[PDB]
């Protein structure tokens, strides 16, 4: 009727707001669920949904958002996460007493189910409000940068935040992706280039490569310790791009350091490390193969002009030792070797 | 394995062993195990595992369900199967939907659709509409073909209540052999 559903509704509203005050114990579940049930049974489900949305929205806008706004400059993360927790706990019960509408009504009207609606309200009204958003991004990124600079940070907080974003994605990484992962990847890239220049400047090729591997491992550990697992693949892609891929020729051609120097002095371990590293990115093995090809060709051709077969058989032996131990008997390396030989034997 | 586990759970209930809650409807008092009810239903699960007063209550009462029906449904929860006929079906579907046992709701729905007759209609389209079984609404209205009664079109309008005064001609699909239906009805509808 006109006034029946309203008389039920004021009760339901009082109950919901009550649940949001954490005094929920003392509320009769059977009564609330029954009332919601009958209200839906009377085809008033739309009103129930709307009222739900408005009560929840009012709670998150007028209190929670203000709660995390006054907390900006002390325990910001703890406050936000506490708010997230309280919100979840409340929306559990709110879902439970609205369960009948949730299972049946929401489907045919194509509207978000109770809990996911709650997630949407919390996302838009709090985390995405834009003071909270910017300060959150800056907080996490700053903490990560600091941890990269050797300082100790609280990884629990970061983990909780990233998780929260993942949840707010509604069975998706989207909000976690755009609010956190992307600027994280940008920043990380910048920092990585910054370190790469330093290492390339003051080191040899071998220690540089070892440092790239170690870099990868630290970043992976950071992914599993703090961030979401899904961010493992993107960040390593960045590490490999900045440290290895942009610098490939610089790395292989280092004077008294890189590929030709490792061939001359027969460093097998270093060639193994270089091969293993450069097998990660496209054109790496091709880079090694090209530099090597040039070397072997100039040397062999220099040999062809002014016994003979023992020198050649020893060279063949040497490069077969390389190919076997270092280069993992790779087809590309074999083909480029035989190519060099077939070139300068003529 | 689980079948026999339930089979003995039943015995333990009837021997009133390890029963942590009594649920009462009107006449009947049913002892049961909280975890079995919580396992077979989301309603009971949210009730017993909830932070709301019911969970701290050793005894408890649910209404808008008659006693015999409640007994039948707890018996369903334990035995996994149920009996459904035309007498009980319409007190069965809303009561099961309340306690959130959906397989039973589906049972009653299938049973309703199965018996559809030119006269049947009626509650089947109304029930669904009120009980939000949509497949049944679709099935019932797709079942409306050239009925042409004065009498059981009487059935059509009579139990569809007031909102149908809207949806009767709000539906543009209606094409009638005798066009009288708009007038003779209303005064009679106004007579009653």
Author numbering:
A (entry chain B): 26 to 331, 340 to 379
B (entry chain A): 32 to 223
Paper text:
The structure of human KLHL3BTB-BACK/Cul3NTD complex reveals a 2∶2 complex, with two chains of Cul3NTD bound independently to two equivalent and non-overlapping surfaces of a KLHL3BTB-BACK homodimer. The Cul3NTD chains are positioned to form a cup enclosing the space where the substrate-binding Kelch domains of KLHL3 are predicted to be located. The structure of the BTB domain of KLHL3 resembles previously solved long-form BTB domains, and consists of a three-stranded β-sheet flanked by seven α-helices. The strand-exchanged interchain β-sheet involving an N-terminal “β1″ strand has been observed in many long-form BTB domain dimers, but is not present in the KLHL3 dimer. The KLHL3 BACK domain spans residues 150–276 and is expected to consist four sets of helical hairpins, however only the first 5 helices (two and one half hairpins) could be reliably modeled into the electron density maps. The Cul3 binding interface on KLHL3 consists mostly of surfaces in the BTB domain, with important contributions from the BACK domain. Overall, the KLHL3BTB-BACK/Cul3NTD binding interface consists of 25 residues from KLHL3 and 26 residues from Cul3, and collectively bury 1066 Å2 of surface area. The φ-x-E motif that was first identified in the SPOPBTB/Cul3NTD structure is preserved in the KLHL3, where the large hydrophobic residue designated by φ is M83, the charged/polar “x” residue is S84, and the conserved glutamate is E85. Cul3 binding induces an ordering of this region between α3 and β4, including the formation of α3.1, in all three BTB/Cul3 complexes. Several hypertension disease mutations in KLHL3 map to the Cul3-binding region and disrupt complex formation.
